[PDB]
């Protein structure tokens, strides 16, 4: 199996196979610990941000990919954002501060 | 294909700063800012940057000096333009 | 004690009231009549209450509103 | 020694303590505590070992 | 008003628990009266050294 | 400059309680209706859970009714139905609210374990819930009348009270009540009163509970939270796109359960408003309010209540709490896993042609993976008009795109990964080589680290998108850059099986073959001779070789000689580069030596030469292994000829013991043990037979008749080289296999007398089955256990990362060889290797500094230390490191995939845990000296007896063997009262008996001479009168105080040493006389008046393991029957007997206030009631609790205990784990400490040793001259130590989500990140490694100019 | 487990005492389970399901 950029999931924006075009491989907690141990920071960021969960990140990446510029403008993963809304839906006020 | 970055880790230590700096340079090329310091063997900007580290002609110090110089390279041309903005008084 | 489920809370809280005796139904309904009609008489003793009905009926025959809005039936 | 721990006395009291076990918190009734216990292990309908 | 550690044993293992008393024997008895009904065999009661 | 206004970068997430207005902030409208969609035109019904007016337009930049559909009109709110036209994405963002009629309690603050609403007012939960359900009233602001404030009343009571007091006394009921309580409450006043109260009465049960509460109060104040907010006025609704109504095939719909819940809450709320306007009776409005509370609860968290079920479905609807918590243990979407683009997978294949830096990547796969890059390059060169056309090109797969792809593949590495990722080597970077077919080709040498059999395992691939990811992969994750297991210095790239068999078959030598005896100049023609078939691969031939040595400073020497070697070894030498001596290839080259070759090559020539060396070794290995024609036949496994005989003889033994039991000569169990013993013995016989008949049995000839050497038998070559198989397994092939135990765990006395080469009949197989399924289950489960262990470990460490370069402390631990019992179980070299020195080491003669101060001890220095006699070195460790909130580089060490000192910023906690966890799968009379040397008696007091020997009068005693080099060889423990032929400073030979004793007896032996007297020994009370029946010599046996009669129970029996005069001979050199009391059950030897000498007995007293062991260790678990240690140094006595627990009174010789404990004397005592004992001495025996070691012995003592024990577990299984990692786990393990003395912070608290130390060190100077505070280091298990993390976002990962969120919310905690997990969650660069620089610069810019 | 009466032990781990226990269970093919069990004080207890 293989995939570059496929269809995604509605609830949480995440890679999902629609066409039997197999959704991306799962990157688990251990698989994260490996990158931690190595100390590859950007590999990790892009792994859980721009290559997966970041709704803007994915496309803003792809554009730079074809343009020959290898970079990332990561932003915030939709998982955490969804969690912000879910928590703040309760009587809990959770804000992002400073600058 | 640079098989071992050992000779590169030698020049600039810590081996993380290596990846960081060599990245900075590799983009100083891939984004068209400049051209290689050594024959490109078809090596991509990654390996070109690495080779540049091995030869000891590229590091944090060198890059910073180069860039800070370029800031003035632009200040020189803009010397007349930005000074003509005195209308702010 | 309270088994926590509101079903039993309500179930017991209501079961504290006795069934109405067949006499008591008429007694209570009578009390109702006394009260209501009393507030009605209280309305009738207000001059502006009458004047308003007149001022509105003036608008009814003036085609500025329908009868169905100002009344339903007389006593009849 | 089991009897010394037994809270109940007669058939009725036992049936009550049982009905307040199987369906705890709702008021126990005679017909209730009877119907339950009979319907558990003695009911041709609700029970069988085959 | 003082405090002493009470070691209570068990099936798979054993563990210590704080017991507050005045006398070592009072601590013993409080430890029994507390843990014994649970079936935790009482091993040793040590006064907290507090240097 | 101006601070800021709107969106920028951010840091420091804060969480706190919500306010009705703060809630009305995020709300862009109030949902007034339970309706969702129109039922025909699926457009949203306005003012409903789904609404365009409140939330957002259905389709992008298009208003609902459709008045403005153009992308031009954007910031316009429509006139018809106000919907501003903007991206439908904002329907995932905008929130809304609901205005609740009656106030409602927030269930998270009610039913949480520390019920918050409850302990804020100090009101019991049972009561508050009683009030909410309208079961009873509650007073508030009682004023001066009859009644307390928090006090509760009932119907008739409230009535009566009202009749008595109309005003000045207030009471409410329901949610409104609790709200009134919280609102009326004054925090500051309560604080003042609590202070005065704390101060008036002094009691432990009072002021502790008092201060504990005042703390929480003032904290709640400083938080910013107002108590009112605990009660819900307004309820925010989650955005619609987060709980969608979205369509589906078949016209059917699907929607989140949150819609059902919200619908219920809304409906009931409205019904309440109406019932208010209709002036319904009380019972009804109450019932309704209750129902609403229930609904709101079910929405927030369902299951603290009656557990509502979803519409026409039994399964309980998933509430918001479950939306947060997620499931599958504890993770929310950023831990357990996430789907990722640019990735793939497939079955893996071999590819021996590969170089260690590359891997075969399937053509189609590489096409699909790099598709975006391919597009770019394609239209970059101009082979494609536009991006669309490029897509059509690769969709067609036009012939040019293959070359276009071969462009992007060149310097762009790819990541490869296997299923059970354990240690960082589980994911590595390679260079793609385009290959036909659908299979991934993986370099065989790397097959070790991945733990990948070729049996159909599959490997995932990932593409390093951003440039930084490429350089990160190539300089770190690059396979060629990790040749060394991060756990231990040894090479992980070591040849595995086929290759080692090849090199074995070469480096081997036989007796007489082709070219035997001849001579050839170089290996160059030694290869020619073999290839021609004129010379055999293994024959002894003197040949010239030029070997190099780099001995000259930075410079390679050269020499040559006629070496006695073999044709094969000679040929093999052609690979070995430069500085390596020829002596490395002259051996037999087993899987061990073949590794040390590579290791030495790395530590000498550097990285590149080692890499290319390894590639070559693999190639030649496979080649010559193939040429070797090694195979496995059925006759290759040779069964001993004497087998059946051994079987028969042991079979005679069983019948002998059978006859014995038949005649009752032996008991059932005695017989059973005998039979099992002799059978096991037989098994050993057959085994040690087969190994011999297999090993050297090949007998051959050179020029003579017979000369015998090692066997050329295939399976033997395999087992000997280390290619595969082992003596233990071969044993099962040829010799009989074992005995089996029934599921009960009891071993059967009918072993398997047949082997695999023979037939195993029905029985033997059936009996083997249990052991089989048991095995499979065991390993399959221990996999999961290993995983769990690793998880706890990474949780307890994590954020620990190298921070400071050098902390500069002289503190460290003393590294010495392990010296386990008879002989060394691990050398000093491996222990100190790769580490740094704490201070200058000295030659036996001083004034000379071998290794100065702190210097990394590398191979050369370790060698220098080995040149001299040095028996130990002070080493700096992570556990002793002065660095606060991290570890300095100099303290950690070198070890890594590289030999250089640790890099600044690498995450040590992670690698430590991973290293400890990778091997986790694999797991379960008198002293006689061995070597020659001298005698050392460590910590001993003794006396010379009348036999001219030496007897030990001390409990703790050691015996060290000090050889002529001065370093230690052996170490032993010599029991009290032991006779020695030698003494301290004497000389012994190999196998000379030094210590001698009786294991069954605890002698009372005296240190002086004189007459024996009986003091306070009376018959019928203290002593019982008994005479020996086997001899007739009688002794008065001492009676224990758990038995004795009335008057003599309180009297301790003693044998007091006197002299001829009737005086008292004292203890040598003291004011104290000599009287040695007697214990219970102890039978005396000599009677009253009889004379004795030194060293003579006054009397004689009678008498797990595996992975869970490691777990119990790291968790600091207290064992079942722990040995008890003396609390305080001093001489200890007995008394009071009370209730079966004997009292032990330690009498200090120095001070006083002798301390007494109650020890259950049913346990056998190791101490002496008449003897002094130092603190932390054995008063008994058995495993000791870690807490004890820390509290009594010391920090370094316990830090040594842990590492030594866990290492004792691993090293028994053949596992190499450097002490470092375990030491970091220890450092985290003891991190917290408890304060004893005051003067800055709280008294009994649990604060961090790092925080403390920074505070007191801050207070040792400046401040107050010293107001500083004393603490006590504490030992917390890893699972417990992981519990404390400053970051709450981190805590929400592993811990219980609900609790953490609430507990942090009330305090208004501010999570600043700074850690790994907390950053990974929010998707920001890891504050370590490549990003440690970023987080550093950011941290520095923060809280500064 | 076939319907009928079942006499178990459950020694060891229970209560740490070592006095063991003895439990019986009547499991039908359908309907409620009838359990009888002892305790450390040798008091005979019964529970449905
Ligand atoms: Mg396998
Ligand atoms: Zn409109
Ligand atoms: Zn340090």
Which one, of F79, F102, F83, lies nearest residue F91 by Cα? Answer: F83
Q: Which domains are present in chain B?
A: 1-89 (3.90.940.10)
Question: With a CB-CB cutoff of 8 Å, which residues 12-71 of chain C face chain F?
Answer: 13-14, 17
User: If we measure between CA atoms, which residue out of G42, A30, E44, D38 comes closest to residue F1159?
Assistant: E44
Residue F159 contacts by C-beta under 8 Å, 6 or more apart in sequence? none
Report, in this order, helix, strand and coil percent for chain A, each rounded to 5: 40, 15, 45
- The whole-angstrom distance between F1317's CA and the closest CA on chain A is 10
CB F355 within 8 A of CB F363: no
Handedness of CA F854, F856, F857, F860 (dihedral sign): negative
Token pair belonging to F474: 């190539």
Ligand 2 midpoint to CA F1175 (Å): 86
Task: Give A-chain residues touching B18 at CB under 8 angstroms.
Answer: none
Residue F1323's CATH number: 1.10.150.390
Q: How many domains does chain A divide into? A: 1
Distance CA F1250, CA B36 (A): 49
Contacts of F410 in chain B (CB under 8 A): 1, 42-44
Give the burial string for F144-163 (b: 16+ CB within 10 Å, else e).
Answer: eeebeeeebbeeeebeebee
Distance, C-alpha E20 to centroid of its chain:
9
CA distance F292 to F298: 10
Q: How far is the CA of F77 from the centre of ligand 2 (A)?
A: 8
Which residues on E lie below 8 Å from G12 (Cβ)? 11
* Total residues found in chain C within this entry: 76
HSE toward the beta carbon, residue F21, CA cutoff 13 A: 2
F383 CA to centre of own chain: 56
Closest CA to E46 of F1166, F1129, F1272, F1124: F1124
The minimal CB distance from B19 to the residues F411, F611, F1330 is found for F1330
Domains recognised in chain E with CATH numbers? 1-51 (3.10.20.510)
Q: Do C8 and D25 touch (CB under 8 A)?
A: yes
Q: What CA–CA distance (Å, rounded) separates A32 from A29?
A: 5
Show the domain range for A53: 14-99
Q: What residue has token string 């365009």?
A: F52
Question: How many H-runs (helices) and E-runs (strands) does chain E carry?
Answer: 1, 3
How would DSSP label each residue in F980-1041? ES--TT-EE-TT-B-EE--TT-EE---SS-EEEEEES--BTTTEEEEE-SSS--EEEEEPPT
Q: Do F410 and B44 touch (CB under 8 A)?
A: yes
Chain E residues near residue G15 by CB distance under 8 angstroms? 11, 39
Data resolution in angstroms? 3.9
Residue G9 CB contacts under 8 Å (≥ 6 apart), including other chains = G20, G21, G22, G23
What does DSSP say about strands F1130-1135 and F1142-1147: parallel, antiparallel, or unpaired?
A: antiparallel
Q: Which CATH number goes with the domain that contains F668?
A: 1.10.132.30
The C-alpha atoms of residue F1309 and residue D29 are separated, in whole angstroms, by 54
What are residue F648's phi and psi, to 5 degrees? -65, -40
Q: Verify whether the Cβ–Cβ distance B30 to A39 is below 8 Å.
A: no
Minimal Cβ distance to A96: which of F13, F337, F371: F13
Query: If residue F118 lies in a helix (H) or strand (E), which one and from where to where?
Result: helix F116-121
Q: How far apart are the C-alpha atoms of D44 and D38, rounded to whole Å?
A: 10
CA–CA distance, F394 with F378 (Å, rounded to integer): 10
Per-residue tokens: F971: 């170490």
Interface residue of D1, D2, D17 to substitute, partner G, most G CBs within 10 Å: D2
Interface test with A, best of B9, B21, B30, B33 (most A CBs within 10 A): B30
Number of CB pairs, chain A paired with chain B, less than 8 A apart: 7
Closest CA to F262 of F313, F230, F299: F299
Residue among F968, F1048, F1055 at smallest CA distance from F1003: F1055
d(CA F383, CA C13): 84
Q: Which of G19, B71, A52, E44 is nearest to F1123 (CA)?
A: E44
The beta-carbon neighbor of D1 closest among G4, G28, G42 is G42
3-state DSSP call for residue F480?
helix
F481 CB neighbours in chain B (<8 A) are 4-6
Q: Which domain holds residue F963?
A: 925-997
**Interface contact flag, E44 F1127, Cβ < 8 Å:** no
Which alpha helices (DSSP H) does chain B contain, by range? 6-11, 16-30, 45-54, 60-83
Ligand nearest to the CA of F457: 1
Give the ranges where F241-329 is alpha helix by DSSP (H).
257-277, 282-300, 320-325
Rounded CA-CA distance F1292/A92 in Å is 14
Residue identified by tokens 């008595």 is: F164
The residues facing F837 across adjacent strands are F875
Tokens at residue F1271, please? Answer: 């603490």
Under an 8 A CB cutoff, do E44 and F1117 touch?
A: no
Do E and A count as touching (3 or more CB pairs closer than 8 A)?
no
Q: What gap in Å lies between CA B52 and CA B58, rounded to an integer? A: 6
Residue D6 in contact with partner chain G when CB distance is under 8 A = no
Structure determined by:
X-ray
Cβ neighbours around F691 below 10 Å, total: 18
Please state, in angstroms and rounded to a whole number, the distance separating the CA atoms of residues F718 and F631: 10
- In 3D space, the residue among F696, F686, F700 whose CA is nearest the CA of residue F641 turns out to be F686
CA F392 from centre of chain: 53
**Nearest residue to F407 (alpha-carbon basis) of F439, F384, F388, F381:** F381
Contacting residues of D for G45, CB less than 8 Å apart: 2
Which strands, in side-by-side order, build the sheet including F1091-1092? F1075-1077, F1054-1058, F1010-1015, F1091-1092
Question: Residue written as tokens 């609902």?
Answer: F64
Look at D24 and C8 and tell me if their CB atoms are within 8 Å.
no
Q: Which residue matches tokens 């830096």?
A: F357
């Amino acid at each position: 199996h293989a995939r570059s950029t496929g269809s995604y999931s509605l609830v949480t924006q995440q890679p999902l196979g629609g066409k039997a075009q197999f959704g991306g491989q799962r990157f688990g907690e251990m698989e994260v610990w490996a990158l931690e141990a190595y100390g590859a920071a950007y590999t990790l960021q892009e792994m859980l941000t721009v290559k997966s969960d970041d709704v803007n990140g994915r496309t803003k990446m792809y554009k730079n990919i074809v343009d020959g510029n290898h970079q990332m403008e990561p932003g915030m993963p939709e998982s955490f954002n969804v969690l912000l809304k879910e928590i703040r839906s309760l009587g809990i006020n959770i804000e992002l501060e400073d600058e | 294909a640079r098989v071992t970055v050992q000779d590169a880790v030698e020049k600039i230590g810590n081996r993380f700063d290596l990846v960081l700096v060599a990245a900075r340079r590799a983009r100083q090329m891939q984004v068209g800012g400049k051209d290689p310091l050594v024959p490109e063997e078809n090596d991509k900007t990654t390996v070109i940057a690495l080779r540049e580290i091995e030869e000891g002609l590229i590091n944090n110090q060198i890059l910073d000096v180069r860039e800070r110089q370029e800031q003035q390279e632009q200040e020189a041309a803009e010397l007349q333009a930005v000074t003509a903005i005195a209308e702010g008084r | 004690g309270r088994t926590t489920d509101p079903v039993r809370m309500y179930m017991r809280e209501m079961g504290t009231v006795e069934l109405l005796t067949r006499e008591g139904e008429i007694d209570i309904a009578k009390r109702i009549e006394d009260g209501i009609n009393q507030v009605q008489c209280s309305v009738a003793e207000y001059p502006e209450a009458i004047t308003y009905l007149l001022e509105q009926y003036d608008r009814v025959e003036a085609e500025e509103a329908r009868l169905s809005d100002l009344i339903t039936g007389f006593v009849d | 020694e089991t009897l010394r721990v037994d809270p109940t006395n007669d058939r009725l009291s036992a049936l009550v303590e049982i009905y307040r076990m199987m369906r705890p918190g709702e008021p126990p009734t005679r017909e209730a505590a009877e119907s339950l216990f009979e319907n558990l292990f003695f009911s041709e309908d609700r029970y069988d070992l085959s | 008003n003082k405090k002493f550690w009470a070691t209570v044993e068990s099936s798979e293992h054993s563990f210590e628990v704080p017991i507050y008393a005045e006398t070592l024997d009072e601590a013993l008895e409080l430890a029994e009266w507390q843990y014994v009904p649970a079936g935790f065999e009482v091993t040793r009661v040590r006064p907290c050294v507090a240097p | 400059l101006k601070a800021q206004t709107k969106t920028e970068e951010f840091d420091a997430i804060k969480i706190a309680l919500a306010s009705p207005d703060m809630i009305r902030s995020w709300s862009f409208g109030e949902v007034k209706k339970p309706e969702t969609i129109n039922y025909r035109t699926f457009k949203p019904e306005r003012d409903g859970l789904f609404c365009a007016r409140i939330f957002g337009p259905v389709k992008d930049y298009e208003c609902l009714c459709g008045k403005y559909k153009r992308l031009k009109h954007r910031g316009v709110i429509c006139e018809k139905c106000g919907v501003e036209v903007t991206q439908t994405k904002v329907r995932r963002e905008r929130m809304g609210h609901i205005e609740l009629a009656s106030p409602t309690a927030h269930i998270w603050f009610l039913k949480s374990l520390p019920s918050r609403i409850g302990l804020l007012l100090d009101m019991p939960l049972r009561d508050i819930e009683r009030v909410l359900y309208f079961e009873s009233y509650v007073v508030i602001e009682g004023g001066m009348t009859n009644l307390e404030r928090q006090q509760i009343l009932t119907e008739e009571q409230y009535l009566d009270a009202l009749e008595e007091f109309g005003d000045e006394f207030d009471a409410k009921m329901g949610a409104e009540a609790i709200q009134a309580l919280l609102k009326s409450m004054d925090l500051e006043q309560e604080c003042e009163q609590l202070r005065e109260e704390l101060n008036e009465t002094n009691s432990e049960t009072k002021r502790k509970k008092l201060t504990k509460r005042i703390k929480l109060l003032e904290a709640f104040v400083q938080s910013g939270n107002k108590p009112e907010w605990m009660i819900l006025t307004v309820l925010p609704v989650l955005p619609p796109d987060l709980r969608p109504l979205v369509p589906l095939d078949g016209g059917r719909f699907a929607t989140s359960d949150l819609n059902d819940l919200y619908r219920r809450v809304i409906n009931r709320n409205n019904r309440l408003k109406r019932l208010l306007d209709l002036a319904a009776p009380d019972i009804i409005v109450r019932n309704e309010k209750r129902m609403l509370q229930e609904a709101v609860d079910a929405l927030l968290d369902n299951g603290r209540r009656g557990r509502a079920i979803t519409g026409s479905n039994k399964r309980p609807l998933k509430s918001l709490a479950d939306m947060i918590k997620g499931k599958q243990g504890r993770f929310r979407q950023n831990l357990l896993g996430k789907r990722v683009d640019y990735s793939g997978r497939s079955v893996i294949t071999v590819g021996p042609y590969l170089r260690l830096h590359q891997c075969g990547l399937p053509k189609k796969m590489a096409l699909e993976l790099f598709k975006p890059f391919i597009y770019g390059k394609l239209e970059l060169r101009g082979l494609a008009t536009t991006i669309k056309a490029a897509k059509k090109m690769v969709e067609r797969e036009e012939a040019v795109v293959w070359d276009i792809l071969d462009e992007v593949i060149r310097e762009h590495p790819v990541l490869l990964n296997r299923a059970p990722t354990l240690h960082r080597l589980g994911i590595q970077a390679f260079e793609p080589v385009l290959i036909e077919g659908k299979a991934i080709q993986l370099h065989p040498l790397v097959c070790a680290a991945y733990n990948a059999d070729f049996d159909g395992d599959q490997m995932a691939v990932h593409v390093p998108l951003t440039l930084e990811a490429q350089l990160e992969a190539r300089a770190l994750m690059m396979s060629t850059n990790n040749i060394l297991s991060p756990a231990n210095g040894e090479p992980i790239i070591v040849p595995s099986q086929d290759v080692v068999l090849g090199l074995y078959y070469m480096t081997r030598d036989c007796v007489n073959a082709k070219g035997e005896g001849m001579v050839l100049t170089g290996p160059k023609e030694a290869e020619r001779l073999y290839r021609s078939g004129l010379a055999s691969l293994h024959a002894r031939v003197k040949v010239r070789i030029t070997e190099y040595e780099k001995d000259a400073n930075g410079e390679l020497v050269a020499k040559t000689s006629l070496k006695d070697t073999t044709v094969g070894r000679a040929i093999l030498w052609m690979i070995v580069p430069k500085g390596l001596p020829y002596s490395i290839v002259n051996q037999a080259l087993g899987k061990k030596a073949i590794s040390k070759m590579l290791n030495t090559c790395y530590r000498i020539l550097g990285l590149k030469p080692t890499v290319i060396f390894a590639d070559q070794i693999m190639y030649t290995g496979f080649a010559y292994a193939a040429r070797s024609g090694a195979s496995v036949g059925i006759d290759d496994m040779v069964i001993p000829e004497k087998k059946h005989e051994i079987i028969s003889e042991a079979e005679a033994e069983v019948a002998e013991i059978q006859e014995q039991f038949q005649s009752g000569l032996v008991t059932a169990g005695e017989r059973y043990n005998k039979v099992i013993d002799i059978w096991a013995a037989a098994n050993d016989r057959v085994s040690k037979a087969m190994m011999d008949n297999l090993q050297t049995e090949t007998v051959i000839n050179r020029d003579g008749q017979e000369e015998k050497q090692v066997s050329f038998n295939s399976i033997y070559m395999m087992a000997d080289s280390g290619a595969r198989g082992s003596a233990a397994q071969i044993r099962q092939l040829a010799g009989m296999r074992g005995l089996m135990a029934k599921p009960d765990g009891s071993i059967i006395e009918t072993p398997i007398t047949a082997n695999f080469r023979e037939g195993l009949n029905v029985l033997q197989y059936f009996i083997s089955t249990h052991g089989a399924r048991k095995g499979l289950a065991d390993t399959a489960l221990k996999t999961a256990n290993s995983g769990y262990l690793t998880r706890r470990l990474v949780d307890v460490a994590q954020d620990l990362v190298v921070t400071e370069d050098d902390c500069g402390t002289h503190e460290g631990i003393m590294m010495t060889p392990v010296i386990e019992g008879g002989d060394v179980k691990e050398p000093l070299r491996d222990r100190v290797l790769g580490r740094v020195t704490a201070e200058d080491v000295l030659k036996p003669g001083t004034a000379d500094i071998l290794v100065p101060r702190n210097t990394l001890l590398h191979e050369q220095w370790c060698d220098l230390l080995e040149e001299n006699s040095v028996d130990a070195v002070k080493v700096r460790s992570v556990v002793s490191c002065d660095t606060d909130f991290g570890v300095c580089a100099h303290c950690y060490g070198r070890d890594l995939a590289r030999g250089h000192i640790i890099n600044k910023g690498e995450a040590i906690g992670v690698i430590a845990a991973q290293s400890i966890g990778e091997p986790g799968t694999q797991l379960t009379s008198s002293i006689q000296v061995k070597n020659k040397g001298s005698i050392k008696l460590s910590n001993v007091k003794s006396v010379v007896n009348s036999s001219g020997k030496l007897v030990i009068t001390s409990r703790n005693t050691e015996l060290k063997l000090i050889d002529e080099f001065g370093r230690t060889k052996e170490s032993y423990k010599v029991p009290y009262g032991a006779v020695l032929a030698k003494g301290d400073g004497e000389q012994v030979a190999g196998g000379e008996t030094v210590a001698n004793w009786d294991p069954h007896t605890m002698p009372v032996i005296t240190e002086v001479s004189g007459f024996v007297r009986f003091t306070d020994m009376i018959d019928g009370q203290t002593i019982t009168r008994q005479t020996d029946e086997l001899t007739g010599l009688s002794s008065l046996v001492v009676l224990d105080s758990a038995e004795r009669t009335a008057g003599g129970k309180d009297l301790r029996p003693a044998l007091k040493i006197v002299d001829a005069q009737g005086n008292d001979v004292l203890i040598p050199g003291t004011d104290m006389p000599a009287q040695y009391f007697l214990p219970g059950k102890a039978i005396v030897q000599l009677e009253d008046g009889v004379q004795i000498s030194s060293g003579d007995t006054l009397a004689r007293i009678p008498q797990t393991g595996g992975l869970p062991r490691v777990a119990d260790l790291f968790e600091a678990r207290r064992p079942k029957e722990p040995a008890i240690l003396a609390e305080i140094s001093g001489i200890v006595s007995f008394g009071k007997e009370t209730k079966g627990k004997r009292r032990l009174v330690i009498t200090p010789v120095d001070g006083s206030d002798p301390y007494e404990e109650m020890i259950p004397k049913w346990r056998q005592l190791n101490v002496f009631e008449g003897e002094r004992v130092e603190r932390g001495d054995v008063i008994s025996d058995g495993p000791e609790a870690p807490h004890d070691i820390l509290r009594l012995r010391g920090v370094h003592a316990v830090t040594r205990y842990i590492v030594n024990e866990v290492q004792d577990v691993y090293r028994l299984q053949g596992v190499k784990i450097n002490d470092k990692h375990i030491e970091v786990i220890v450092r985290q393990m003891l991190r917290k400490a408890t304060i004893v003395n005051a003067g800055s912070s709280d008294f009994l608290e649990g604060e961090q040793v790092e925080y403390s130390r920074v505070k007191i060190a801050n207070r040792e100077l400046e401040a107050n001259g010293k107001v500083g505070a004393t603490y006590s280091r504490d030992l917390l298990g890893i699972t417990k130590a992981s519990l404390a993390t400053e970051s709450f976002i981190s805590a929400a990962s592993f811990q219980e989500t609900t609790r953490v969120l609430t507990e942090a919310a009330v305090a208004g905690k501010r999570d600043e990140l700074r850690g790994l997990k907390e950053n990974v969650i929010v998707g920001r660069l890891i504050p370590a490694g490549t990003g440690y620089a970023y987080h550093q610069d950011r941290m520095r810019r923060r809280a500064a100019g | 487990r076939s319907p009928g009466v079942f006499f178990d032990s459950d020694k060891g781990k229970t209560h740490s005492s070592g006095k063991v226990l003895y439990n019986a269970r009547i499991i039908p093919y359908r309907g409620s389970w009838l359990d009888f069990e002892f305790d450390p004080k040798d008091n005979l207890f019964v529970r449905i399901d």
